[PDB]
């Protein structure tokens, strides 16, 4: 009791020492940011948390999220102290030859989500906690450590409100209030009262502690939890480093070698005993979850010729897949009546998460829900508002996450709402995400098939859906695969291969009809996936059409279908590629009128074709 | 003043009627969202605000920002009531032939910033108010109307904290607490007390009012202001629409014709007088602002061969431009010691705005400050964290904003911090923004020239800067233009044109040096701007090097320099293009080690060249 209390202090001081050794050895890193959190980390990992020290990914463990990811050395140090990492490896921090990278990443068994972009951790932790309480109904708790500067990010406050709305009493945020950010004091500095007022206003039980008192930390964590709990820790940046504690201009500055030896000796001389604390194992009450392929319970049941918006087919398809597996969950940001995710909510309400008008958080929640393969999430909103969550999506890829995003209302074809609602840069954005597969389904059938494939594909999947009702053109037994395009109109005398998708596929087919009046035939190709792109079928089609390719897309010129095709085929002998896309910020009108205005309707397609001979 | 109160009530009801007529005529729009705000709008435009009804852009006017932009029809209605718009034009809402678009846009003289993507208005309002108080030091105030659903956006809370930090007592936010969002009730519904506590916690003076009482509204606006003021208005969605008021399932639903005629009749019967209120003009105390081009006080003074990181060159150039004109302002997100915007802070502290770790708000503040051409802002952070502000940037283009953004730490060349800090999708992101100019300066001189061009170029300018110290290669008298590239190495026997930028241009030049040992000459081209690209110089260069182009970039394959070049040259007869780029999520290491690992350093370039002949 007085032995355990002193061992915790000693642990904290060991954790300080290692943070210094590692960053001094690397020649870079953030020792003063680790040092403010040492007692916090000691009490968390060697008193409060319950986990298997030799099996960090174990589904019964408490979770820890290091939202202030630049303190990575003290996370590494705690897993050495726990006996998972070798103590010697700590010194290899930031090396090309080590997995102890500058910020945490999931190649590390003890890391679920990559942090590094500040303000994202608590949202991931909300996902884990929500999963904990409502999906696997287990006893595990979730702990998230944030900086004070980090609290200026709006994403943090979305996560705060989400936790209280959903009564995440299994969630604890620890706020490292060390007064300073990177380049100056944090706005609120040591005004602990205001931090408490903000947290309480957002529905949290907020406890102010001295963050360098292991006693106060233990009491705070020991209190009964009836709502999300915020431990607001008054600390000093660089605590325990003589001449550096509470000083400006030391963020991200490693101690030089000779100074570090002095500092380490002083901290070491504070250590009363070398005996290490063992981690306490968890209760093993998380259910088993089966990772098999998830199949639609039947073939699609559309009728060729019927009309359906791909956004509504997405909804029907998601709801349908939710009957095949318990693992499928749906999130939406107050647009469920526009994206048709409300269909899933109706049929499977327990597995619908209303995220409200908070796209950054919605994405983070999904990433959290997918950690340790507990669920298979589909998030939806207008594709335009996924731009609000680009940094979260980017970090999702760095976190090697398997999440599925469906963005509706793509392009100028939405009509009257105008450009604030029109997704015209979403192909560019999603194509630039390293682990991404981009589906652009043209049909209700192709939509159902995209949903099924996305659920079983590793990495980040985006499904681009559309507002207008278009014809079913595919038979229900049609076979779809990632990276396989479809030729949906062909003849022995095709003069151009026209590639379109979604609404521009249908405009291209209408253009074929107008052109058959003038005895001009065109081959029409639907990509299905924009990334990866079926290079082979595109090339074989071009060679059947005197090498001529025309691409037409409801998207800006940059980063879209046209550019994917061009870079796929550049330098092939005989091949020419011309483009139709949207050249400027649009405006309000009827869908058909905007497609004409922006040169991507049937008439524009026919007129481009005639210009190519 | 009892005649006045009744005239405000009559005005409120004229505004409902018009919202209904316009949306019913259009067949789309959001009349229930207009109706909750009718009294708020009446009191603002016909009692509280001071502005010139016949000159909405007048620099002495109070500003109004309609953050909940789907309420556009009631905005349009107040501007008809003030005599600026013809009343008959309101019925052309949303038509291809009208400028009364679905959401407000700056083609409307009464609109400064486009809204439509919720949660961004208050940030722009913050920038206007900051400008009002600290730059033009004028008497005008700034009023911003938000929805309650909209307050779930984290961007709103950044703006709130910013406004109290910077003592914006000339800023008033009105919160339309109408209980409901798009697809369900808003989380806090009518718990007015919690709204009050959240606002107060964030340093605002919060006044709860009945949002349908013109008297309570007038009282609230007339209170003394010593801090930013939040008028928290309890309202009912669809107020005054019998059978619809406070009901679910009516968001974005126009009344059908026969119902609209019955409702309008009932509202009209409440109106006692037809006599319109006149707008009160402002006190005209804003200073004049010069519109001239802003030139560097001298030519660059670098020395060929000296070594400087482009990130540092940026800080130096901005500070230098800051001596030429007091219109240049600098904003930074707690990274000023890393982007070198601290040099500007040091030299012109009155014109530096610390935005803290709130990248969304920073972009919105910049956009606000740039409205009505009052200032020329340059925002800075790491390029990777601009992905956090992508929607705000997307909306800035729709706002036709002239702002400048500088993103440091691009690529794998930052080294040890790892992928979370590495910008590898920023060229894609900024290329997809329709009004963008993308500068990628390769040395100190190019960076100084980019800063000067950016200040004077219309639209969104992005300047990508780098962490490594590379050699100055241009002399100080070199002339740069948007859209003009530079051949930095050539000879009469060049075998390939290699396009690099930033670190990859320097890697290409070093590759030239290895290769001349084997008697292989290459032509090295620095694009300067990636958008627009100097197509002509690229083709002319490729024609002198056997049609062969090799692109090398510290950026992912999609949407980068490689794809921009492929799409510019595809189908040209001479021409082949091969690409070197980053193929996957990176990891920690020394700069030179990551460049080698990802195949974009001198040796990879040299070898790619050998494989092309
Ligand atoms: C979204 C984002 N913006 C900016 C950065 C740059 N950055 C790295 S650490 C840091 C300061 C964080 O200060 P704080 O939250 O107080 O943490 P401390 O180091 O003091 O514990 C910043 C701004 C980042 N990593 N992520
Ligand atoms: C960032 C963003 N996400 C989603 C939307 C879709 N949307 C349009 S209006 C609306 C509901 C807004 O409700 P509220 O703020 O309560 O305004 P109200 O219409 O009730 O006055 C939504 C979700 C949007 N415009 N912007
Ligand atoms: Ca801090
Ligand atoms: Ca509302």
Give A123-189 as a DSSP string.
HHHHHHHHIIIIIS--S--EEEEEESGGGGSHHHHHHHHHHHHTT-TTEEEEEEE-SB-SSSB-TTT
Label residues A407-422 b or e (16+ Cβ within 10 Å = b).
Answer: bbbbbbbbbbbbbbbb
Subunit contact B421:A103, Cβ cutoff 8 A = yes
Taking the C-alpha atoms of residue A381 and residue A332, their distance in angstroms, rounded to an integer, is: 6
Taking the C-alpha atoms of residue B561 and residue B527, their distance in angstroms, rounded to an integer, is: 9
B372 in the same domain as B272: no
Tokens of A266: 């002083």
| A119 to chain B: closest CA residue | B357
Taking the C-alpha atoms of residue A146 and residue A159, their distance in angstroms, rounded to an integer, is: 12
Strand pairing category for A171-177 and A229-234: parallel
DSSP 8-class letter at A580:
E
Residue A500: half-sphere exposure toward Cβ, Cα within 13 Å: 29
Q: Note the residue count of chain B.
A: 613
* Residue A394, helix vs strand vs coil: helix
CB distance A66 to A75 below 8 Å:
yes
Q: Which atom of ligand 1 is closest in space to residue A186's alpha carbon? A: 16
Q: What are phi and psi of B204, to 5 degrees?
A: -95, 155
Phi-psi category of B120—alpha, beta or left, where left has phi over 0 and alpha has psi -120 to 50?
alpha
Tokens of B175: 């919160």
**Cβ-based neighbour number of residue A39 at 10 Å:** 30
What are A175's strand-pairing partners? A146, A232
Taking the C-alpha atoms of residue A51 and residue B193, their distance in angstroms, rounded to an integer, is: 40
Taking the C-alpha atoms of residue A19 and residue A36, their distance in angstroms, rounded to an integer, is: 11
Cα A604–A569–B530 angle (5° rounding)? 80
A497 in the same domain as A467: no
The two counts, helices (H) then strands (E), for chain A are: 21, 19
Taking the C-alpha atoms of residue B462 and residue B451, their distance in angstroms, rounded to an integer, is: 10
Subunit contact B150:A357, Cβ cutoff 8 A = yes
Cα A368–A370–A373 angle (5° rounding)? 135
Number of domains in chain B: 3
How far is the CA of A345 from the CAs of A256, A354, A456, in angstroms? Answer: 57, 9, 21
Taking the C-alpha atoms of residue B579 and residue B374, their distance in angstroms, rounded to an integer, is: 43
Domain limit, last residue, from A265, A288, A311 = A288
Is the bond into B532 cis (omega within 30 degrees of 0)? yes
Subunit contact B564:A558, Cβ cutoff 8 A = yes
Give the list of residues 6+ apart from residue A122 with CB closer than 8 angstroms, or none: A65, A67, A144, A146, A155, A156, A159, A160, A163, A173, A364
Tokens of A131: 């999963």
* Residue A267, helix vs strand vs coil: helix
CB distance B23 to B250 below 8 Å:
no
A385 is in an annotated binding site: yes
Please tell me if residue A26 touches chain B, with a CB cutoff of 8 Å: yes
B502 in the same domain as B452: no
Contacts of B356 in chain A (CB under 8 A): 149, 152, 181, 186-187
How many A from CA of B32 to the centre of ligand 4? 9
| B182 to chain A: closest CA residue | A334
CATH number, domain of A505, equals 3.40.50.920
Q: How far is B141 from chain A (nearest CA, A)?
A: 25
Taking the C-alpha atoms of residue A84 and residue A100, their distance in angstroms, rounded to an integer, is: 13
Print the domain residue range for B610: 483-613
B residues 345-384 lying closer than 8 A (beta carbon) to A: 354, 356-358, 360-361, 384
B194 in the same domain as B338: no
Q: State the DSSP string of B58-88.
A: -TTSPEEEESSGGGHHHHHHHHHHTTSS-GG
Q: Note the residue count of chain A.
A: 613
Domain limit, last residue, from A447, A463, A482 = A482
Contacts of B29 in chain A (CB under 8 A): 416
Taking the C-alpha atoms of residue B392 and residue A388, their distance in angstroms, rounded to an integer, is: 8
Q: Is B60 in the pocket of ligand 2 (CB under 6 A)?
A: no
B185 in the same domain as B221: yes
DSSP 8-class letter at B250:
-
Subunit contact A96:B589, Cβ cutoff 8 A = yes
Which residues form the pocket of ligand 1, taking CB atoms under 6 Å from any ligand atom? A 33, 36, 68, 70, 116-119, 147-150, 176, 178, 180-182, 186, 237, 251; B 333-335, 357, 385, 388
**Cβ-based neighbour number of residue B16 at 10 Å:** 29
A280 in the same domain as A197: yes
B311 is in an annotated binding site: yes
Q: How far is B401 from chain A (nearest CA, A)?
A: 12
Domain limit, last residue, from B288, B306, B334 = B288
Phi-psi category of B154—alpha, beta or left, where left has phi over 0 and alpha has psi -120 to 50?
alpha
Subunit contact A418:B103, Cβ cutoff 8 A = yes
Taking the C-alpha atoms of residue B537 and residue B440, their distance in angstroms, rounded to an integer, is: 17
Please tell me if residue B458 touches chain A, with a CB cutoff of 8 Å: no
How many A from CA of A149 to the centre of ligand 1? 6
Q: How far is A240 from chain B (nearest CA, A)?
A: 25
The helix-helix angle for B72-81 and B2-26 (nearest 10°) equals 130
Taking the C-alpha atoms of residue A152 and residue A155, their distance in angstroms, rounded to an integer, is: 9
Q: What is the largest CA-CA distance in chain A?
A: 93
Q: How far is A418 from chain B (nearest CA, A)?
A: 6
Taking the C-alpha atoms of residue B461 and residue B318, their distance in angstroms, rounded to an integer, is: 14
Query: How many Å separate Cα B254 from the centre of its chain?
Result: 31
Query: How many Å separate Cα B79 from the centre of its chain?
Result: 25
CA B227, B228, B229, B230 torsion: positive or negative? negative
Which among B377, B382, B431 is positioned nearest to B402, based on CA atoms? B377
B362 in the same domain as B277: no
H/E stretch holding B461 reads strand B460-464
B171 is in an annotated binding site: no
Give the list of residues 6+ apart from residue B589 with CB closer than 8 angstroms, or none: A94, A95, A96, B415, B416, B597
Give the list of residues 6+ apart from residue A16 with CB closer than 8 angstroms, or none: A34, A35, A38, A74, A239, A240, A241, A267
Taking the C-alpha atoms of residue B605 and residue B498, their distance in angstroms, rounded to an integer, is: 8
CATH number, domain of B92, equals 3.40.50.970
B169 in the same domain as B136: yes
A494 in the same domain as A456: no
B587 in the same domain as B560: yes
Name the closest ligand to CA B68: 2
Which among B228, B252, B113, B105 is positioned nearest to B174, based on CA atoms? B228
A295 in the same domain as A386: yes
**Cβ-based neighbour number of residue B324 at 10 Å:** 16
Token pair 């930090």 is found at: B165
Question: Strand (E) positions, A260-403?
Answer: 307-309, 328-332, 352-354, 376-382
How far is the CA of B37 from the CAs of B13, B41, B147, in angstroms? Answer: 11, 6, 9
B578 in the same domain as B473: no
Give the list of residues 6+ apart from residue B313 with CB closer than 8 angstroms, or none: B302, B441, B443, B444, B445, B447, B448, B465
Instruction: Report the catalytic residues of A.
Output: 359
* Residue B551, helix vs strand vs coil: strand
CB distance A440 to A373 below 8 Å:
no
B385 is in an annotated binding site: yes
Nearest Cβ partner of A593 from B96, B198, B575? B96
Is the bond into A238 cis (omega within 30 degrees of 0)? no
């Amino acid at each position: 009791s007085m032995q355990k209390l002193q061992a915790l202090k000693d642990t904290a001081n060991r954790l300080r020492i290692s943070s210094i050794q590692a960053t001094t050895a690397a020649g870079s890193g953030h020792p003063t940011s680790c040092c403010s959190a040492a007692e916090i980390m000691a009490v968390l990992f060697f008193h409060t948390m319950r986990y298997k020290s030799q099996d960090p990914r174990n589904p019964h463990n408490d979770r820890f999220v290091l939202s202030k990811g630049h303190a990575a050395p003290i996370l590494y140090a705690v897993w050495a102290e726990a006996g998972f990492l070798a103590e010697a490896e700590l010194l290899n921090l930031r090396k090309i030859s080590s997995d102890l990278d500058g910020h945490p990443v999931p190649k590390q068994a003890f890391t679920d989500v990559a942090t590094g972009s500040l303000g994202q951790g608590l949202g991931a932790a909300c996902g884990m906690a929500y999963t904990g309480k409502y999906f696997d109904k287990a006893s595990y708790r979730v702990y998230c450590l944030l900086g004070d500067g980090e609290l200026s990010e709006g994403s943090v406050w979305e996560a705060m409100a989400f936790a209280s709305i959903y009564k995440l009493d299994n969630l604890v945020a620890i706020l490292d209030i060390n007064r300073l950010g990177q380049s100056d004091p944090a706005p609120l500095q040591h005004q602990m009262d205001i931090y408490q007022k903000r947290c309480e206003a957002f529905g949290w039980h907020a406890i102010i502690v001295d963050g360098h008192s292991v006693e106060e930390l233990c009491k705070a964590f020991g209190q009964a939890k009836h709502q999300p709990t915020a431990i607001i820790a008054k600390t000093f940046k660089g605590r325990g480093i003589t001449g550096v504690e509470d000083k400006e201009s030391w963020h991200g500055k490693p101690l030089p070698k000779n100074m570090a030896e002095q500092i380490i000796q002083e901290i070491y001389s504070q250590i009363q005993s070398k005996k290490k604390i063992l981690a306490t194992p968890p209760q093993e009450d998380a259910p088993s979850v089966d990772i098999a392929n998830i199949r639609m319970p039947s073939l699609p049941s559309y009728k060729v010729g019927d009309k359906i918006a791909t956004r509504k087919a997405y909804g029907q398809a998601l709801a349908k897949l939710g009957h095949a597996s318990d693992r499928i969950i749906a999130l939406d940001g107050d647009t469920k009546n526009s994206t048709f995710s409300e269909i899933f909510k109706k049929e499977h309400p327990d597995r619908f998460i209303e995220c409200y008008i908070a796209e950054q958080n919605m994405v983070s929640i999904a990433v959290g829900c997918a950690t340790r393969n507990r669920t298979v999430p589909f998030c939806s909103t207008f594709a335009a508002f996924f731009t609000r969550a680009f940094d979260q999506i980017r970090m999702a890829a760095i976190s090697e996450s398997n999440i599925n995003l469906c963005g509706s209302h793509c392009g100028v074809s939405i009509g009257e709402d105008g450009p604030s609602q029109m997704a015209l840069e979403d192909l560019a954005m999603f194509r630039s995400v390293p682990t991404s597969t981009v589906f652009y389904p043209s049909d209700g059938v192709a939509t159902e098939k995209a949903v099924e494939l996305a659920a079983n594909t590793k990495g980040i999947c985006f499904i681009r859906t559309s507002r207008p009702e278009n014809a079913i053109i595919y038979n229900n037994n049609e076979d779809f695969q990632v990276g396989q395009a479809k030729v949906v109109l062909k003849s022995k005398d095709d003069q151009v291969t026209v590639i379109g998708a979604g609404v521009t596929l249908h405009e291209a087919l209408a253009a074929a009809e107008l052109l058959k009046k003038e005895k001009i035939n065109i081959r029409v190709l639907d990509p299905f996936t924009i990334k990866p792109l079926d290079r082979k079928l595109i090339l074989d089609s071009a060679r059947a059409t005197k090498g001529r390719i025309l691409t037409v897309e409801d998207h800006y010129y940059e980063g879209g279908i046209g550019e994917a095709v061009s870079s796929a085929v550049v330098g092939e002998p005989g091949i020419t590629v011309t483009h139709l896309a949207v050249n400027r910020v649009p405006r309000s009108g009827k869908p058909a009128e905007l497609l004409k205005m922006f040169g991507i309707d049937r008439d524009a397609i026919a007129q481009a074709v005639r210009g190519l001979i």
